[PDB]
Amino acid sequence: NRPNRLIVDEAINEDNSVVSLSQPKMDELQLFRGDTVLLKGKKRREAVCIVLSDDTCSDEKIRMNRVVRNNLRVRLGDVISIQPCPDVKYGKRIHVLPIDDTVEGITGNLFEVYLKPYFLEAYRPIRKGDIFLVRGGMRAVEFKVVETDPSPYCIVAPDTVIHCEGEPIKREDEEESLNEVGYDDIGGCRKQLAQIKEMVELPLRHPALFKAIGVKPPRGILLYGPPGTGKTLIARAVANETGAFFFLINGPEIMSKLAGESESNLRKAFEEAEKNAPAIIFIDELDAIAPKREKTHGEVERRIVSQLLTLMDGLKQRAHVIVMAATNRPNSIDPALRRFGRFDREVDIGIPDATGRLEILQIHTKNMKLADDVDLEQVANETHGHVGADLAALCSEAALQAIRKKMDLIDLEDETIDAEVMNSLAVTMDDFRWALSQSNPSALRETVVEVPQVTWEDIGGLEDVKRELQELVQYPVEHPDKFLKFGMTPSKGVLFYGPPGCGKTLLAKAIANECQANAISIKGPELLTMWFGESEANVREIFDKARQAAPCVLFFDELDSIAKARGGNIGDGGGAADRVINQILTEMDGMSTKKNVFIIGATNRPDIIDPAILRPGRLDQLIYIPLPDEKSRVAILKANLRKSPVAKDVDLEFLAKMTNGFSGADLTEICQRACKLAIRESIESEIRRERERQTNPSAMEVEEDDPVPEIRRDHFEEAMRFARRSVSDNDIRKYEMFAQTLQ
């Protein structure tokens, strides 16, 4: 509602020298006509020039040659703040040099060829950094800044000397413009970017407030994540969007020097950041400079680690210098860096998901023309283990597959380079399929922490169980005050036990989906890997991760695997304890009820698991997952058949009652077998049809009425004979005996 808060809209004068007006807004302003008005947009850039060639349109908005959306702004929604600052000095001459196209074609003198018909009573009332379209020709070439006789913006006059003998190109400013990446260039990290924004915006943008009072700035931010996840890009985007100076340092160029020169370069780099404050220093691949102390072997390799620590502590006086680093894991560097005054804030970039992958695909394919049948949603679903760069490669490779496959000989000598071939060309789905299928070895094998997609409706029954899950998990986060009022401490564990294939792995995902929390799944094979490898420290790395992504759910299944390996329940030797559950208990006990971390366990042999895990605390609630009932069986059948064309004479209700004791796994196998029969019949019919008319002396015969559009009753009848029960009544009797003896 600020009186000088107004939007900007379209423009019609192509000489951006014009600055608009709005009489309703002018009356509130003191805007004068003449050379210059000091206007203000975003990220400290500006564009000042002659004014008031407007009022053709309505009011409440400002007009300006659309170039001010790329320079000084990005897009609609911004708000001009135009306050005049007229009667500015007139230097000798103001940075006469174009950049992009003036090299292509007749270059001449670059002054007396194209621009001379512009400054005629409008002698370049212009700011340094302004860029606009000006030509004596096609009418579109940019303009930039090299010379600066006076420091601030000025106006030129005749009888002045120009220095345009320089060559157009990407200037330091032009490289800086691409470098002016912004937040649009990043996608798939919504939380981490906000966390960084809240962390550094106040110190860099508003130093004065921090000067007045006593608050601690962010001394060190350590971003750890796998390679190719856009970290230096994030640093550049954040630095530019706040207008702070950005300095880059790399490890290899510091360890590829002679002994003293590396320290000298580090000192010079630190000095070159305190004279441009507020500024940011970014160091990438820190693992190359400061590795683990034991790993570090030699003398000069420690003289470069102590120097860095000393330099870090010389910043308590100055709260306007910030340092951000990048590594893979935090335990790959000396802990001395992790302290209270050197590197106290940590961020995990992590991995993107279907949404983030789709956003990255959209950004990468902005200028890549895709004619049709490019959903980009199925691509995100089929890319499991891809990070950043990989997708970019994908985008390129498919594009190459578009031209290489058929344009191999067309573009050799028939024509020179032309755009009618490049733009007329498109990219199809088969190119993406070939790229993704053929030459995409994913570079990820790390665990994933992300919300799943399974909903409650995917589970046939267990109505009572879901109520208990809600009570246990959602209420403490939903209503903490009620829990505290009654002097109550909520539980933090639950154990599932039941026969195999009854739907225990799905609940852990459905609960997280309902509660909107991340989930982590750990299998039995990993526990055996730790047992044989005798590496129990990894357990810590698990729990730490769970603490970083709070709120979250931690899932362990096949807990009985280790007790199974060493003999039966009696075992070849020893008791019910081992070297891997002891560590799990140690981590569990040393964990606060806060941070909303829930733990779930699953097994089918509760008699052999360690009793210590069932004590008060740890996992004290036990739930029995039974075989589904006939109604549950019809429900599972509908859930499994919800994604296939199976309209049939037979009725799933008929199938369910015939089943007796069938587990959930058995009901997901009948459908697969029936569909296998249907697809085999379809393929046989297609091959015979395609073969008959051509092998026969019949040139052209067309008929494609789908012989197998759906799964008819016959396929299910065949499949029913091939499927039986997969359990015995003795297992059910054992489970019932345990469910009864617990009393």
Ligand X SMILES: Nc1ncnc2c1ncn2[C@@H]1O[C@H](COP(=O)(O)OP(=O)(O)O)[C@@H](O)[C@H]1O
* Residue 230 assigned to a binding site: yes
Least separation in angstroms between residue 555's CB and ligand X is 10
331 vs 223: CA distance, rounded Å: 13
Is 417 near a copy of itself (CB under 8 A)? no
12 vs 100: CA distance, rounded Å: 24
Is 412 near a copy of itself (CB under 8 A)? yes
Q: At what angle do helices 389-404 and 429-438 cross, to 10 degrees?
A: 120
Q: Of the listed pieces 192-200, 294-302, 417-425, 501-509, which binds ligand X according to CB under 6 A? A: 501-509
E-assigned strands of 15-149? 38-40, 61-63, 81-83, 97-98, 143-144
Is 75 near a copy of itself (CB under 8 A)? no
CB burial of residue 594 (10 Å; 0-12, 13-18, 19+): exposed
Give the residue, chosen from 165, 413, 534, 703, that forms a contact with a copy of itself under the rule CB under 8 A.
Answer: 413
**From the list a copy of itself, ligand X, none, partner contacted by residue 79 (C-beta under 5 to 8 A by kind):** a copy of itself
Is 503 near ligand X (CB under 6 A)? yes
Task: Identify any residues that bridge with 555 across adjacent strands, giving them in sequence order.
Answer: 521, 600
Asked if 37 and 62 count as a contact pair (C-beta separation under 8 A), the reply is no
Contact pattern for a copy of itself over residues 42 through 61, marking x by CB under 8 A: ----------------x-xx
- Separation in Å, CA 23 to CA 29, 38, 80, 332, 385: 9, 18, 15, 63, 58
3-state helix, strand, coil split of the chain in percent (to 5) is: 40, 10, 50
191 vs 189: CA distance, rounded Å: 6
**From the list a copy of itself, ligand X, none, partner contacted by residue 503 (C-beta under 5 to 8 A by kind):** ligand X
User: Looking at beta carbons only, is 414 or 420 nearer to a copy of itself?
Assistant: 414
Is 715 near ligand X (CB under 6 A)? no
722 vs 395: CA distance, rounded Å: 45
Q: Of the listed pieces 72-80, 217-225, 333-341, 476-484, which binds a copy of itself according to CB under 8 A? A: 72-80
Asked if 354 and 380 count as a contact pair (C-beta separation under 8 A), the reply is yes
- Separation in Å, CA 84 to CA 146, 155, 605: 25, 15, 81
Q: How many residues bind ligand X (CB under 6 A)?
A: 18
Least separation in angstroms between residue 345's CB and ligand X is 39
CB burial of residue 9 (10 Å; 0-12, 13-18, 19+): middle
Give the residue, chosen from 26, 38, 79, 576, that forms a contact with a copy of itself under the rule CB under 8 A.
Answer: 79
* Residue 29 assigned to a binding site: no
259 vs 239: CA distance, rounded Å: 32
Least separation in angstroms between residue 500's CB and ligand X is 4
Structure tokens at 283: 């160091």
User: Looking at beta carbons only, is 329 or 404 nearer to a copy of itself?
Assistant: 404
Is 504 near ligand X (CB under 6 A)? yes
75-97 burial by CB neighbour count: b if 16+ within 10 A, else e?
A: eeebebebebebebebbebbbbb
- Helix, strand or coil for residue 456? helix
Least separation in angstroms between residue 421's CB and a copy of itself is 14
Q: Of the listed pieces 76-84, 266-274, 430-438, 727-735, which binds a copy of itself according to CB under 8 A? A: 76-84
Give the residue, chosen from 3, 77, 214, 611, that forms a contact with a copy of itself under the rule CB under 8 A.
Answer: 77
**From the list a copy of itself, ligand X, none, partner contacted by residue 636 (C-beta under 5 to 8 A by kind):** ligand X
* Residue 675 assigned to a binding site: no
CB burial of residue 139 (10 Å; 0-12, 13-18, 19+): exposed
E-assigned strands of 142-268? 143-144, 220-224, 245-250
Least separation in angstroms between residue 573's CB and ligand X is 28
Give the residue, chosen from 459, 559, 562, 678, that forms a contact with ligand X under the rule CB under 6 A.
Answer: 459
Is 355 near ligand X (CB under 6 A)? no
479 vs 519: CA distance, rounded Å: 22
Kindly report the CA angle at 183 between 177 and 187, in degrees rounded to 5?
125
- Segment (H or E) for 490: none
Residues 516-575 that bind ligand X (CB under 6 A): 557
**From the list ligand X, a copy of itself, none, partner contacted by residue 413 (C-beta under 5 to 8 A by kind):** a copy of itself
Least separation in angstroms between residue 556's CB and ligand X is 11
* Residue 384 assigned to a binding site: no
Is 469 near ligand X (CB under 6 A)? no
Residues 647-706 that bind ligand X (CB under 6 A): 664-665, 668
User: Looking at beta carbons only, is 77 or 697 nearer to a copy of itself?
Assistant: 77
User: Looking at beta carbons only, is 388 or 628 nearer to ligand X?
Assistant: 628
* Residue 258 assigned to a binding site: no
Give the residue, chosen from 178, 208, 258, 409, that forms a contact with a copy of itself under the rule CB under 8 A.
Answer: 409
Give the residue, chosen from 148, 265, 474, 505, that forms a contact with ligand X under the rule CB under 6 A.
Answer: 505
* Residue 227 assigned to a binding site: yes
- Segment (H or E) for 586: helix 581-589
DSSP string, 718-743: HHHHH------HHHHHHHHHHHHHT-
**From the list ligand X, a copy of itself, none, partner contacted by residue 412 (C-beta under 5 to 8 A by kind):** a copy of itself
Least separation in angstroms between residue 144's CB and a copy of itself is 39
Least separation in angstroms between residue 8's CB and a copy of itself is 9
Among 690, 686, 676, CA closest to 722 = 676
Q: Using DSSP bridges, classify how beta strands 552-556 and 518-522 pair: parallel, antiparallel or unpaired.
A: parallel
Is 480 near ligand X (CB under 6 A)? no
Contact pattern for a copy of itself over residues 3 through 32, marking x by CB under 8 A: --x-x-------------------------
195 vs 742: CA distance, rounded Å: 48
Dihedral pair phi/psi, residue 336, rounded to 5°:
-55, -35
User: Which residues contact ligand X (rule: CB under 6 A)?
Assistant: 458-461, 500-505, 557, 602, 628, 636, 639, 664-665, 668
**Binding residues for a copy of itself, per CB under 8 A?**
1, 5, 7, 58, 60-61, 77-79, 409, 412-414
Residues of the binding site for ATP: 227-233, 328, 364, 501-506
Binding site, residues? Answer: 227-233, 328, 364, 501-506
